[PDB]
Amino acid sequence: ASGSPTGGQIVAGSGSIQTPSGNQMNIHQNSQNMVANWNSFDIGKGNTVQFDQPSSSAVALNRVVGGGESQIMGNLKANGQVFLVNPNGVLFGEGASVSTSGFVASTRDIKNDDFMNRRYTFSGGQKAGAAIVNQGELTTNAGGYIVLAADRVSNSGTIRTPGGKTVLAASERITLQLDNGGLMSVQVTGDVVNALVENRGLVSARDGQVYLTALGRGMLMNTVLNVSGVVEASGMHRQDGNIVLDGGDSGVVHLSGTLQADNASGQGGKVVVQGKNILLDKGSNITATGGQGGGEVYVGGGWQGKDSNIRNADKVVMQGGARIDVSATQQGNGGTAVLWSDSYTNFHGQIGAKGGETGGNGGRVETSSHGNLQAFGTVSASAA
């Protein structure tokens, strides 16, 4: 645990490093893509690391080749984009602030040549027990992205990617395709033992998208994806989903917090919750309401499990006191809410799909299973 990154050297691209003076380290970048290796990459409280980059779409890769888990307690700022790779993991402290146009923290490595060719695929080299934990504040400029990729990813603080994307991913491999400085798409493949993505804090991608994906192996009923806080992607409805949870083909996806994709001045967003076993616990709240129309919430599959782009669950359990709301609030039709499984759907919660107060028809709700169905909750899908 040091106060500032040390042992830095530019090994690809063109740039310069200045050690701390006045509690701030300055890293200047000349090329569009730059690689710096670091003995360590810690930032103490009250200290800043400032990247001065040629373009908001420039990328600096920072690889820790020393031994310690990165301790980021102070500030990291950049006008462009920053990748931080540490096989031993990263902790962002309660006071930490990271503010960039796009930020990746990964325990999986990337090859220098791939990165300098703008082929952003990360895999291999992680140490056993390495996690990425955020207890501070990670934020990007509008349209940027934040990607945290490790065997275990935990957010108890705040992540904000307005008009952009947040991706928390526990997988063996992750590939980022960037388009004009924005995150165009993400592919995650390969299972990881004890894979875990947990959000006790706040993830907010206003007018953006949040994607949480954990791929474990042989969990039985160990949790792979746990959201006890708030995931919010209010704004324009997106066909590919405003909030997408994917627990893979093993383990439990547990929601006790809130997934929020509302749109007071339009149609509600789309929330997709996938996994093998999904538990919507008491107090959980999935809301995709819209002033001009309700949104779509799919838990365990699409309508009757016939959406190839949504994984079909084996079991879905919605506890009493859990709620889903796809209502239209002002004018327009209620949205669509689906609980689906292949083997067992136990519905004890509340699903709302009302039409607008000033007009509109009730929405469409399905609580079903290819196998066993226990439907004991409440569904309100009526006009006002």
Author numbering: -3 to 380
Can I see the authors' text?
EtpA is exported through a Gram-negative, two-partner secretion system (TPSS, type Vb) comprised of the secreted EtpA passenger (TpsA) protein and EtpB (TpsB) transporter that is integrated into the outer bacterial membrane. TpsA proteins share a conserved, N-terminal TPS domain followed by an extensive C-terminal domain with divergent sequence repeats. Outer membrane TspB proteins recognise the N-terminal TPS domain of their cognate TpsA to initiate exoprotein translocation across the outer membrane with simultaneous folding nucleated by the N-terminus.
The crystal structure of EtpA67-447 solved at 1.76 Å resolution revealed a right-handed parallel β-helix with two extra-helical hairpins and an N-terminal β-strand cap. The asymmetric unit of the EtpA67-447 crystals contained four symmetrically independent but equivalent monomers. Strands from adjacent turns align to create the parallel β-sheets PB1, PB2 and PB3 with 13, 11 and 14 β-strands, respectively. While β-strands β1 and β2 (red) form part of PB1 and PB2, they align antiparallel to the otherwise parallel β-sheets and serve to cap the β-helix. The interior of the β-helix is dominated by hydrophobic, aliphatic residues, especially valine. The extra-β-helical secondary structure elements all pack onto the outer face of β-sheet PB1 broadly alligned (anti-) parallel to its β-strands. Despite low sequence identities of EtpA67-447 with the other TPS domains (34% for HMW1-PP, 35% for HxuA, 27% for FHA30, and 23% for HpmA265), the domains all form analogous right-handed β-helices with tightly packed, hydrophobic cores and characteristic aromatic clusters in the first helical turn (W34, F47, F79, F88 and F99 in EtpA).
